Structure formats: C-alpha cells, structure tokens
Tab-separated table of N, CA and C in Angstrom:
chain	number	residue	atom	x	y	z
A	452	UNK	N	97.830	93.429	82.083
A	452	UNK	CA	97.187	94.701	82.332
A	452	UNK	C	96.921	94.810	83.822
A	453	UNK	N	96.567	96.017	84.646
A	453	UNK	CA	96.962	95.773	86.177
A	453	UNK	C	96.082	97.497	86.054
A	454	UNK	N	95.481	97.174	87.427
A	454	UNK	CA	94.966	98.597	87.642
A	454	UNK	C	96.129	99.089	88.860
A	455	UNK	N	96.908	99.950	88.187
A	455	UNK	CA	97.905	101.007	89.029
A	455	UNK	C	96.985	102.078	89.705
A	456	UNK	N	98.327	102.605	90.351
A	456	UNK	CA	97.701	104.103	90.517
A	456	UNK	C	97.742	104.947	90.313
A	457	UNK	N	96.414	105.853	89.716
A	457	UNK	CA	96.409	107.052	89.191
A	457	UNK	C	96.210	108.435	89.721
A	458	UNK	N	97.095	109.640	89.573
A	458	UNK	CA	97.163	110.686	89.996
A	458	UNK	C	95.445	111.573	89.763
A	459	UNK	N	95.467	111.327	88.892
A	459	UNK	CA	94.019	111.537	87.829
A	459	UNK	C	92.815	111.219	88.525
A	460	UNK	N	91.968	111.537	88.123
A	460	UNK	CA	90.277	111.179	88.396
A	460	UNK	C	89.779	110.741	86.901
A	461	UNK	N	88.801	110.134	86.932
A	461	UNK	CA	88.431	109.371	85.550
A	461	UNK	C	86.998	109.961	85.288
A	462	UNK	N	86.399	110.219	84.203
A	462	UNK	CA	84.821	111.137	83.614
A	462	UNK	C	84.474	109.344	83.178
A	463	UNK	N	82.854	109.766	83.199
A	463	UNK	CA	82.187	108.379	82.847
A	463	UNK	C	82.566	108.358	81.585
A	464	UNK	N	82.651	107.178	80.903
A	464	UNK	CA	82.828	106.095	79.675
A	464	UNK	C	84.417	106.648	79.482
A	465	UNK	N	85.190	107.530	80.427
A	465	UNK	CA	86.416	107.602	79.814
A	465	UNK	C	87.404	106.733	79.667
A	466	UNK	N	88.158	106.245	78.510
A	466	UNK	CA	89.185	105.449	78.590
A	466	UNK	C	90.296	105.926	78.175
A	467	UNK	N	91.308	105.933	79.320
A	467	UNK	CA	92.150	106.801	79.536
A	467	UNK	C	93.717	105.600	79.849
A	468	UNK	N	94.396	105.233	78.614
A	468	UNK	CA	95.507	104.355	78.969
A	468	UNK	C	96.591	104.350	78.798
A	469	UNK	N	96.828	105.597	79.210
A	469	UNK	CA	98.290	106.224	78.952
A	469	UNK	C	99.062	105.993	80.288
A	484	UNK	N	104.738	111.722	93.438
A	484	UNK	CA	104.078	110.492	92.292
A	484	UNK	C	104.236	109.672	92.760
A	485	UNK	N	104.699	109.153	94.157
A	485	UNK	CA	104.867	107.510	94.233
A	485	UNK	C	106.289	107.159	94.093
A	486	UNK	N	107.607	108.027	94.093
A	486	UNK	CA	108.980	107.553	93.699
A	486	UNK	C	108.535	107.026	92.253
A	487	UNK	N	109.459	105.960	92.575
A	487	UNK	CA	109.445	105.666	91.133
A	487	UNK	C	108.516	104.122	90.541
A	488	UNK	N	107.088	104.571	91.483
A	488	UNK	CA	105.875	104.007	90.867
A	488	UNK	C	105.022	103.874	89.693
A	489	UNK	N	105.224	105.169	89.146
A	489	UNK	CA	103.865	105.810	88.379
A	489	UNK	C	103.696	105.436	87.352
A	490	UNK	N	105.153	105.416	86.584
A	490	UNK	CA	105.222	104.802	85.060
A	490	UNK	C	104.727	103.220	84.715
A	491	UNK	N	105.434	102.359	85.506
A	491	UNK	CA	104.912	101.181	85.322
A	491	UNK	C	103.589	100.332	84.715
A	492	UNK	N	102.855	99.589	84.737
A	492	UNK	CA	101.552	99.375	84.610
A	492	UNK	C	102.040	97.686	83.756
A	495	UNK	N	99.145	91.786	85.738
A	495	UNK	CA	98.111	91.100	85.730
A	495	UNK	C	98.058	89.761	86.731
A	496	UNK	N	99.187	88.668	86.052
A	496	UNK	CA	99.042	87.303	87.019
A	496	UNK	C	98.037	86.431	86.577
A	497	UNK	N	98.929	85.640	85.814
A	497	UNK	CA	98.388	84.016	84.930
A	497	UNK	C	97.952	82.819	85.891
A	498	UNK	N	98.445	83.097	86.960
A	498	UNK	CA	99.005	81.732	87.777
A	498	UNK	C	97.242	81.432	88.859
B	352	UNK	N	109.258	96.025	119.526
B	352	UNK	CA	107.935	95.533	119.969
B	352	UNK	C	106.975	95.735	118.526
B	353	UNK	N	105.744	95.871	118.531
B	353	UNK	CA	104.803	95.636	117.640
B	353	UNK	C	103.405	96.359	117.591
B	354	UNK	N	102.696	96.842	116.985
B	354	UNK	CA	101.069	96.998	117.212
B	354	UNK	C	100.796	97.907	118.763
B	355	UNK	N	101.728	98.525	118.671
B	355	UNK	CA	101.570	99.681	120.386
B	355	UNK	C	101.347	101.201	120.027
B	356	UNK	N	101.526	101.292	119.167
B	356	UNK	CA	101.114	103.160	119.034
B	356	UNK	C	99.935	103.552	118.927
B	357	UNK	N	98.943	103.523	119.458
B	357	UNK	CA	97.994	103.861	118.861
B	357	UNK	C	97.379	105.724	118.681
B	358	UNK	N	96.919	105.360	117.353
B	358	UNK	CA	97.211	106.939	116.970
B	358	UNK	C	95.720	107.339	116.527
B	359	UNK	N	95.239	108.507	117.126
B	359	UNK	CA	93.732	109.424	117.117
B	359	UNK	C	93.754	110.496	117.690
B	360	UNK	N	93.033	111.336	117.038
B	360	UNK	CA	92.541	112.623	117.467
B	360	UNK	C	94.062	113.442	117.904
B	361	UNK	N	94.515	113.268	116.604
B	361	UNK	CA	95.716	113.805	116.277
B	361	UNK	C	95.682	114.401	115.015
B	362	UNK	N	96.814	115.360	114.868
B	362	UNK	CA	96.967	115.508	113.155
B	362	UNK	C	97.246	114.282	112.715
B	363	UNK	N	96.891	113.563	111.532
B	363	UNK	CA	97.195	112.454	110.973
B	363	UNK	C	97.944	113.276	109.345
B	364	UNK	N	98.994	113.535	109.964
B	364	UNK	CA	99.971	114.057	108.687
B	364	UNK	C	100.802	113.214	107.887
B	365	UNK	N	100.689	112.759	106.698
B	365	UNK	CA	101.434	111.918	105.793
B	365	UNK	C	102.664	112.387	105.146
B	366	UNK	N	102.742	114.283	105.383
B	366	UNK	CA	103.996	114.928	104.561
B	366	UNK	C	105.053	113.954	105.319
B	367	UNK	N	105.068	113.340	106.351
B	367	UNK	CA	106.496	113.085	107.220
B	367	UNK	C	106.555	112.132	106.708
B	368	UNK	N	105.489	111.162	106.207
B	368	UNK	CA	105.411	110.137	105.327
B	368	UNK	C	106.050	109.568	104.206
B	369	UNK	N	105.173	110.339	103.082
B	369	UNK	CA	105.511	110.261	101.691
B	369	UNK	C	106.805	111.468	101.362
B	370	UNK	N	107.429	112.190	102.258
B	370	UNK	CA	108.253	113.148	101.428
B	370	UNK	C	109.498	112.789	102.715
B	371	UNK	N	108.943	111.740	103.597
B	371	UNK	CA	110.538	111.218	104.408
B	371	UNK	C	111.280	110.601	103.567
B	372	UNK	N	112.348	109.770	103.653
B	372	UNK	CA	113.497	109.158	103.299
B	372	UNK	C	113.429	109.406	101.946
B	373	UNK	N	113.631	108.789	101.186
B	373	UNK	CA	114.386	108.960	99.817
B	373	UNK	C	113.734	108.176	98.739
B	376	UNK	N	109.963	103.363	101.702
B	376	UNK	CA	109.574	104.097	102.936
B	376	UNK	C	108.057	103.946	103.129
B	377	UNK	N	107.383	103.883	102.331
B	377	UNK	CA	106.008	103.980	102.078
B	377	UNK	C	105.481	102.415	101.948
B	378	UNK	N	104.959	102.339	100.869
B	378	UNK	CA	103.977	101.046	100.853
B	378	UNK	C	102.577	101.179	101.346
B	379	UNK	N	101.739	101.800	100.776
B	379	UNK	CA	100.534	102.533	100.990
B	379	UNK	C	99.891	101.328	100.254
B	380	UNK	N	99.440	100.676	101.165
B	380	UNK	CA	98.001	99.675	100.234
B	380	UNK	C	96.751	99.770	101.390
B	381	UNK	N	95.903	100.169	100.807
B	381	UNK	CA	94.931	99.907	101.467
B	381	UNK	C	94.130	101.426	101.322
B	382	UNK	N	95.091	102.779	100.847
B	382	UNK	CA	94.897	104.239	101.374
B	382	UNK	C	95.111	104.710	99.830
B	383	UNK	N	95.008	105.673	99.313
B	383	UNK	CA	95.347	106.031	97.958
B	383	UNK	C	96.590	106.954	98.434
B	384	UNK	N	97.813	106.675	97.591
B	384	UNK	CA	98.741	107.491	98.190
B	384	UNK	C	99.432	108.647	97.763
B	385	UNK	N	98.998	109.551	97.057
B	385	UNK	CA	98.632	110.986	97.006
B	385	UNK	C	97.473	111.649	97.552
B	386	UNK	N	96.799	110.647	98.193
B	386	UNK	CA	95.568	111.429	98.507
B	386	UNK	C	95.153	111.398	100.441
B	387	UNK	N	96.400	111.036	100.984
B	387	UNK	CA	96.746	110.141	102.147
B	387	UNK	C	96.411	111.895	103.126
B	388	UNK	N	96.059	113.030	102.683
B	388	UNK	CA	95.607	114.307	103.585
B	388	UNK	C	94.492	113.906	103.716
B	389	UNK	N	93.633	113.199	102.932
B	389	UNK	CA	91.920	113.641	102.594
B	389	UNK	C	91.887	112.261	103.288
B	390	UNK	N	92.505	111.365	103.921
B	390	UNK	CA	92.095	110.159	104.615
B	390	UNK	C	91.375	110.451	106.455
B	391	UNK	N	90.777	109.905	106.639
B	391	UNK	CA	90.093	109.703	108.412
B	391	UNK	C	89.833	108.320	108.411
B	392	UNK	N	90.089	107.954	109.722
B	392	UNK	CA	89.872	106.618	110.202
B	392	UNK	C	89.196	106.505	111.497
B	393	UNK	N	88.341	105.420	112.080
B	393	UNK	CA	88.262	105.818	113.408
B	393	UNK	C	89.450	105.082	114.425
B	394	UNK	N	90.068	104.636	114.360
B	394	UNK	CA	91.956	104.215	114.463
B	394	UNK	C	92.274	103.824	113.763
B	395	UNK	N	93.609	104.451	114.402
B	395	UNK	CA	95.272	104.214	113.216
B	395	UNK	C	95.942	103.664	114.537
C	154	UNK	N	101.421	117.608	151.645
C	154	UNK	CA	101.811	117.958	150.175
C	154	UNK	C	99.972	117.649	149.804
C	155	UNK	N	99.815	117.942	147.847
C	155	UNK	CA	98.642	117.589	147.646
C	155	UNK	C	98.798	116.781	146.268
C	156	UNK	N	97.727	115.799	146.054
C	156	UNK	CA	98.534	114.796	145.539
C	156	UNK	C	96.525	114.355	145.531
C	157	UNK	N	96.528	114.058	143.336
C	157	UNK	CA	94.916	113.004	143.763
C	157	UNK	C	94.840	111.768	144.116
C	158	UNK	N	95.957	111.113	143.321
C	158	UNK	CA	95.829	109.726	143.957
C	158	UNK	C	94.604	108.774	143.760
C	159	UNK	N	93.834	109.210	142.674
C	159	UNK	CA	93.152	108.386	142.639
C	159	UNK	C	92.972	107.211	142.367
C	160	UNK	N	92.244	106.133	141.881
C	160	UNK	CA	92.011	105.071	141.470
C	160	UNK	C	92.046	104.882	139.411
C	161	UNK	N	93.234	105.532	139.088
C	161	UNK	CA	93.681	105.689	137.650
C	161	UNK	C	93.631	104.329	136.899
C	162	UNK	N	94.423	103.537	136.858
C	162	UNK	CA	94.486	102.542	136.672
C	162	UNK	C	94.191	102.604	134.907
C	163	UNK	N	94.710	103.606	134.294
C	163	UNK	CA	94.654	103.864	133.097
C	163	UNK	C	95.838	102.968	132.466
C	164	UNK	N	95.080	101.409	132.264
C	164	UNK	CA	95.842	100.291	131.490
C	164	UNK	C	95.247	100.736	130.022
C	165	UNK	N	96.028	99.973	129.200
C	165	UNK	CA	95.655	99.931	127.710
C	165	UNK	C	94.641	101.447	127.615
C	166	UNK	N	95.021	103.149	128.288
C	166	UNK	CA	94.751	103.908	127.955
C	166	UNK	C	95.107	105.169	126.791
C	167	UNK	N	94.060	105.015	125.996
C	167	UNK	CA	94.756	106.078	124.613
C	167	UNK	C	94.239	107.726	124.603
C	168	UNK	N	93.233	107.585	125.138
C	168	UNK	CA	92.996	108.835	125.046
C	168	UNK	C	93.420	110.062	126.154
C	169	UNK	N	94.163	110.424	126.029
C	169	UNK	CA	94.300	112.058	126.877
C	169	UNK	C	94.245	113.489	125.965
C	170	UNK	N	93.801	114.490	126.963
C	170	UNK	CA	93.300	115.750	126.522
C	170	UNK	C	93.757	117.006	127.528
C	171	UNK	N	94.581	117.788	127.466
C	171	UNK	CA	94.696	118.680	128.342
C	171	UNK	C	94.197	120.222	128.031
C	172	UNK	N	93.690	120.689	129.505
C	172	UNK	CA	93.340	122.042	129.157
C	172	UNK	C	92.989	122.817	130.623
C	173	UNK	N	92.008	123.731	130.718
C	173	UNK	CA	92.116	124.668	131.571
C	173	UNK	C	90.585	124.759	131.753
C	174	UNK	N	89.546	123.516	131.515
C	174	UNK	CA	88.023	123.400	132.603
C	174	UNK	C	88.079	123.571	134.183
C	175	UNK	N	88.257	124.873	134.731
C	175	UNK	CA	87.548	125.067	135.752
C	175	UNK	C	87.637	126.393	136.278
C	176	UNK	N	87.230	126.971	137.522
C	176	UNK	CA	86.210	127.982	137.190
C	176	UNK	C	85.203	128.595	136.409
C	189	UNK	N	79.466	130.424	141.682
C	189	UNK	CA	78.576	129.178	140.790
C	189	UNK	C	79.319	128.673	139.779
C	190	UNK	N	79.746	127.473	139.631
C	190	UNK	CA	79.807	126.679	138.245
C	190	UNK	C	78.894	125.687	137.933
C	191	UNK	N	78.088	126.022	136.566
C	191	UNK	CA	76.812	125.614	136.006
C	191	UNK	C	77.601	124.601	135.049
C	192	UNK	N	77.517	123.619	134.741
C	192	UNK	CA	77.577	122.724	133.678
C	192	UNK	C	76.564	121.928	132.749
C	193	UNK	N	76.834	121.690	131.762
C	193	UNK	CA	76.051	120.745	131.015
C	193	UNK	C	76.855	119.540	130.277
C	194	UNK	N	76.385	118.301	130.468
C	194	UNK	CA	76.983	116.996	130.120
C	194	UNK	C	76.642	115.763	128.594
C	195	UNK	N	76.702	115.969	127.763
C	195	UNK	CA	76.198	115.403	126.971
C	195	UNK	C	77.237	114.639	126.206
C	196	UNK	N	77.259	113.149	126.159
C	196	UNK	CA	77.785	112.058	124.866
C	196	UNK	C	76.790	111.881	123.746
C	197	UNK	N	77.093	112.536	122.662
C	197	UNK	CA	76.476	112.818	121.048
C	197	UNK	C	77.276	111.826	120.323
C	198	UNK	N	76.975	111.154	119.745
C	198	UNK	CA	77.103	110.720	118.428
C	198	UNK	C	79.339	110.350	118.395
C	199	UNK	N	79.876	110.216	120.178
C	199	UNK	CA	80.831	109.944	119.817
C	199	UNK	C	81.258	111.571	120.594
C-alpha cells in the first residue's frame, strides 16, 4: 500500500481507495 | 555546470514544466498543484 | 563620454530590477518585512 498522488482533496474520516503522464493509476517496501 | 540559476521574483510558471516534453519528477512540491507553490528561492 | 563606473562588484549577484525612478525630489525609504 503506498500513499500516491492524489488529484482530489480528502473530507475528515473519508476513506477514499480507489495527471502526472502516466502516474496516477498505479498505487510499500518490506526491506 | 550545476546549482547556478538562481530563480526569484519571477513568474515561477510550471505550464513549461509539466506540459513540456512528452521530464518532471516533482518530489518535494505537489504536482498538479505546482501554480499555488512560493518559495523564498528556487 | 559618461560612464558610472562605480564600485559594482556585483559577484554572486541575483537580484536586478529595472525601471524609470527619477524625477524638488522628496523621497521616503523604508525595508518592511523583506
């Protein structure tokens, strides 16, 4: 899971988990 | 050369930016939102 | 010829500004906040 970047603005308690070329679609690091 | 441009109290326009070549790598700036940015240098 | 010649020495200088300050001339001088 990875915080990308969003075009969007986010409302409190919203959970929302659904341009950058070809950035936007995409969406951690074990190591 | 390197680290010589220094850029203020200028338009700080990103259209030449994000809508040049076909380039970017925006970390640090949100990069749709790269109009609504000020710095005190660039 | 006329020529200022002054003592510039504008190394590692970034800032320039051009315009048309001049022409009694009364002034006031103030550095605010930058």
């Amino acid at each position: 899971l990875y915080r990308l970047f969003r075009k969007s603005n986010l409302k409190p308690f919203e959970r929302d988990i659904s341009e950058g070329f070809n950035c936007y679609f995409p969406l951690y690091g074990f190591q | 050369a390197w680290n010589r441009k220094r850029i203020s109290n200028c338009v700080a326009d990103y259209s030449v930016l994000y809508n040049s070549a076909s380039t970017f790598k925006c970390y640090g700036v949100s990069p749709t939102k790269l109009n609504d940015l000020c710095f005190t240098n660039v | 010829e006329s020529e200022f010649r002054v003592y510039s020495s504008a190394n590692n200088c970034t800032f320039e500004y051009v315009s048309q300050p001049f022409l009694l001339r009364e002034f006031v001088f103030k550095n605010i906040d930058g």
